[PDB]
Amino acid sequence: AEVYNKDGNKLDLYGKVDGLHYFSDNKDVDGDQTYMRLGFKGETQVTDQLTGYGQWEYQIQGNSAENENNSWTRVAFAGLKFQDVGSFDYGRNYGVVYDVTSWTDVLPEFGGDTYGSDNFMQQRGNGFATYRNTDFFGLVDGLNFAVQYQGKNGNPSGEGFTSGVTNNGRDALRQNGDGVGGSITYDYEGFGIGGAISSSKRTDAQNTAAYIGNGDRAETYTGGLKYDANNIYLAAQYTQTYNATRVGSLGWANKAQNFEAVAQYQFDFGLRPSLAYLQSKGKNLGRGYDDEDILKYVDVGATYYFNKNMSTYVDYKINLLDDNQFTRDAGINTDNIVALGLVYQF
Amino acid sequence: AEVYNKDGNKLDLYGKVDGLHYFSDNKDVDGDQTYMRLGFKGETQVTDQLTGYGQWEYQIQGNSAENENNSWTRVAFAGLKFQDVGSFDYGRNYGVVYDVTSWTDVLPEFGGDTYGSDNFMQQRGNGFATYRNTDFFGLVDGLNFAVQYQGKNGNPSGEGFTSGVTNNGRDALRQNGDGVGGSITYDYEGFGIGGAISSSKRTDAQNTAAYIGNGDRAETYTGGLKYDANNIYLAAQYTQTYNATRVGSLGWANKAQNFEAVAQYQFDFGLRPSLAYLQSKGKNLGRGYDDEDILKYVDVGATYYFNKNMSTYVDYKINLLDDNQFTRDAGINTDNIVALGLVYQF
Amino acid sequence: AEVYNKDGNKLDLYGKVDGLHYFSDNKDVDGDQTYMRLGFKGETQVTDQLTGYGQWEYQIQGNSAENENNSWTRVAFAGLKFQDVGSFDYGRNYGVVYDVTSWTDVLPEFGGDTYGSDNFMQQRGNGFATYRNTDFFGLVDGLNFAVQYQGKNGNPSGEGFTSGVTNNGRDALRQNGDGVGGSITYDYEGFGIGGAISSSKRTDAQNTAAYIGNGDRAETYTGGLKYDANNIYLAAQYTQTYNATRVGSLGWANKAQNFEAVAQYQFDFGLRPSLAYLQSKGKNLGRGYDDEDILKYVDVGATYYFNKNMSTYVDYKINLLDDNQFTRDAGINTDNIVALGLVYQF
């Protein structure tokens, strides 16, 4: 919670430590996943109508030995917020789509893995500019909508590259060009209807013949429904991506028609049994397959909260993906996983 | 100290900065050792009988240049604590043995180097599960005992390995298998008697012919005495490890019979002169030596506290190890060291 | 600001998040420069005349992807401060010269780039020992002067080196030997006159034939003037370095006669228009050039503060360096840059 509050500025340092264990026949994930997150969320009141804010979060891994450090900045964004107008921020922030897919991201640890960090515009990414209007400037409540842009993160500097070079370059699986997107959402009577659209130009370092799924731009459409009332949570979402969904290490997919569903219930003592189904179907991707789903699994779990600071979760990912050549080339999991976690948070 | 305390939860952010300098003829340690530690120790009261807690500490090095970062998570563990029953935690935590050897870890900077981080079960390590009972459920005070388990941390993923692979793999000198251990301690009238036992299965990546000291399991026994009264501190400890004591880079030792002693005195203004002797004898290790001690030195030092936040220490490690072929192969220090430190802590 | 204050010790955790964007034809800097800084500045009152303090700052980069972490410790120093005597600190701290050149370091993001971190003695560096006397032990106010020493940071350990090895070695462009320096400054009636002198022995790893500018020691002289009154800021500074000014990657320069000037004005609402000119002339360096300036540019910018926590700056670096062979060998920028930043700070 808030730790400093005086002279027109408040600042809370938040975070968590998660002692986590993965049990899987797939020895690439089996083991210990203990980690932590630490960050701050500061906000100042410039005037009775203008606000400023800065948030930052840093995830560190606690399962590595003493002689290596695994950690990364999840979010680091600064902006302003003018009342009944909206808020504008810049930095490394969440994607336009994430929010609606965040409706199906209420799992203990798994779930919402039809995308990853440093994807096109569908999760955490750098170079973001987001304008989020709340209540349509007061016409009606729970009618928010956002417009967002992102700049290019091309090839790294110093690696002999001569085209598509940016000071913060990276591997081609995580690069991107100039992209724009929007989102619209209405949440009333508990019922929530959300929609997102995004497009992003692709770089030449990604248009190579090694990575599959060549295309000019990446275009994502998402439509989702949600229901959160009387200790019940239901959510469904359907996304269609064109040249915008990763396929292991082989690159991306031409199309991807994934339909996610999740249902949870909150009991009067702190038990939350969750059931979430995910299927992401790759279609007309190429290389001889020309049709094969990227992901298919169910997740049955239970989270037990003792308060708003201490909790523990059990999770069971039943993977319904048989081992074939496409999976073995892409490196996509096919085994059932168990996740036992103990989370402290402040 | 505590910085946030309200709504049934308290959280203290603690740490220190240490401006340290090493003076040694061994140019591998001679130079600047300035560093810092930062972390949090949060605790919430679930019920009048059930507690939750989470601690985390991160050590960063301040003697490196601007273009590299040296740091690592020392401890990151979360658990619960039920009164007159005990506490159970998980994550990266301290070993079963450490506590009793912690009796001989009261030196300024040196001392307690018969083990290192990511050893078998004798210091900080990942994948820990520890149940510590206090006062034998109330029968008698100062009679605590702990039972602890640790899982395997095998070979890294993505390095072509096909056996003993875990998601948090590392080098073979720091791997381990499934291990279990216990400890029992009685501290009354200042007199403290402690004992620890630990065993750990070894992985096949460690059973190679390159690293010496092949064996099925690693077995450590420790017995120690302590005395802390009327501004006096005495401590002695004897450990015997089988296939569990590192020998530089060549692997481990078959046996190791180390006997540590330490004596310090606290004066009425803040002076603490410390004298600590360490000898760790490797026996029947192989490769032609078949008998040679791993470590032998004395440490004379003085710590001056100005308060509970600011202190400065002088330390003099007289190394009684002559330079032979075994040391030069293992990379074990043989020179006398001086350590001048200025420590601020909060 | 201060977050913990009780029992004779105070501690403030400070920092900032900066959403920054660089626009440049030089694709090595063009892109996103969003970053953050986090640290603590603790201080305890030992006696009514003796103080202890410890500061630490850590800069992390937020423009990198999820699978790499760019960060570094900027300052980490601990010391004591006896009233009307002075303060002594050790660790990674700022250089003797920086302060006077800090008079021309009042730019939004650019400026003060005639040196870099891990230079000889003119900015942040490790192994520092600084004694700063304030008011000449009370004879006259605003007459402070400092004496500072630094030890060697030679070659890294484990890289087959046999001479000039330190436990915290680095690349030869950032090494150094035993150096000493002093500084004297008088600030009265707003008028400030500052002067600094520094000398540093050079290591053999830097005396190679690959890096240009061979010489026994590095010697820097600096003289500067400042004026800060009635919402006006003027500053000028002249440095002459011998074997102490970096030249891209080719090593250093034999001489460097740089003359920096800056002028800013603070308006009654928060606008600060800044104009800063920098020229650093390399002379008699060798390799066939024998005369060529290291840097030459102007910077026109404007910073707008909304409070002491939220601000935003625009900056325009007009580079007056034409592209020749020397620049292309050294890797020195030649293009005009634009910098748009949004800074939140606590």
From TrEMBL, chains A, B, C:
It is a multi-pass membrane protein. One of its GO terms (biological process) is monoatomic ion transmembrane transport. The keyword Signal applies. GO terms for cellular component: cell outer membrane; pore complex. Keywords: Cell outer membrane, Ion transport, Membrane, Porin, Signal, Transmembrane, Transmembrane beta strand, Transport. It is found in: Cell outer membrane. The keyword Ion transport applies. GO terms for molecular function: porin activity. Belongs to the Gram-negative porin family. Homotrimer. This is Outer membrane protein C. It comes from Escherichia coli.
